[PDB]
């Protein structure tokens, strides 16, 4: 799926952003 | 309107802000039923994000 | 043990897989109440992911 | 449990998340041996998505 | 030239075919270590889809 790639992007951003809080 | 937005903008403008907070709380608290906790978090806090 | 995992691994192993599907469905359907929809999606599909 | 799931749910729970992450990295880096790269990506990151 | 292809065309040409084949086998067999299984599947069958 393709918006799954973009949901992928999104979740990854979020988590990485929590890495720095 | 929202319906015509590309996928990233649509998600950013609807669920990303409350998700970021919900995921942060989930990570800190590590509750026994994380999926249930996250859904409850969304329903409990949605008034403040709508 | 899930409780001691780093944040990313903890989230990857609890809520990320159902969240990816939920966000994809949300983006496709663009329902009137997206936060409600997403939380409902979690609760309705939880049994398939835990 | 897992073996009783429909195909889509089974794959979505086991390999789709790490795969999408890997495909994104592959698409950005475009390495010379993409199939090898993706296999290595899976093994290097599997610990994120499962506890062995 | 591969490095200048759009993401979708790039992936479709390099890894999507062997991946779909691999996901089909994974879903049929449902092994205990699916991510490991899929990585091994890729390396075991890569010669089908590329000649180095």
Residue numbers in the entry:
A (entry chain E): 480 to 500
B (entry chain B), C (entry chain A): 47 to 96
D (entry chain D), E (entry chain C): 47 to 98
What did the original publication write about this model?
Dpy30 directly interacts with Ash2L in human (Bre2 in yeast) COMPASS through its Dpy30-binding motif (DBM).
However, the complex of Dpy30C and Bre2DBM was crystallized successfully and the structure (Dpy30C-Bre2DBM) was solved to 2.15 Å resolution. Finally, two separated structures, with the orientation of the helix different from each other, were refined and showed similar qualities with Rwork/Rfree of 0.18/0.21 and 0.18/0.22, respectively. It is likely that the structure represents a mixed model, which was led by the fact that some DBM helices were bound in one orientation and the rest were in a reversed orientation in the complex crystal. The CD dimer plays a dominant role in Bre2DBM binding with a buried area of about 836.2 Å2, while the AB dimer assists in the interaction, forming a binding area of about 292.5 Å2 with Bre2. Ten hydrophobic residues from chains C and D of the Dpy30C dimer are distributed symmetrically on the inner surface in a semi-circular shape, forming a hydrophobic groove. Bre2DBM binding to Dpy30C increases this area to 1128.7 Å2, which stabilizes the Dpy30C tetramer.
